[PDB]
Amino acid sequence: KLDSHLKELRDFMYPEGNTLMLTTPELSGEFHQLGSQLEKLNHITVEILG
């Protein structure tokens, strides 16, 4: 039982086997993409104000 619980909890916390998964990978991608799009919008806003 201890071996099973350890294995199930480890497989959920380490889905790629080697890295502790703290954030949902889908959500981490969306944060990076929104960050990039907002940096472009800021550039357009600075250019027009200039």
């Binding site: 959920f12 959500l27 969306e30 993409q33 929104l34």
Partner: protein, 51 residues
């Protein structure tokens, strides 16, 4: 008896309850947070066109 006492001290939360809480949290991020971020991405793209 030492091992069962150690299991009883560590058991808040229970492993099945923790796996369920982890699965429910993962589903909540996919259903609510991901489609909120995608809407904000599409709004940023429309605001770039409005530029």
């Amino acid at each position: 008896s030492k091992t069962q006492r150690a299991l009883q001290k560590n058991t808040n939360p229970d492993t099945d309850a923790l796996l369920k809480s982890l699965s429910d949290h993962y589903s909540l991020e996919l259903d609510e947070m991901v489609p909120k971020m995608q809407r904000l991405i599409q709004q940023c793209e429309k605001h770039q066109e409005y530029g």
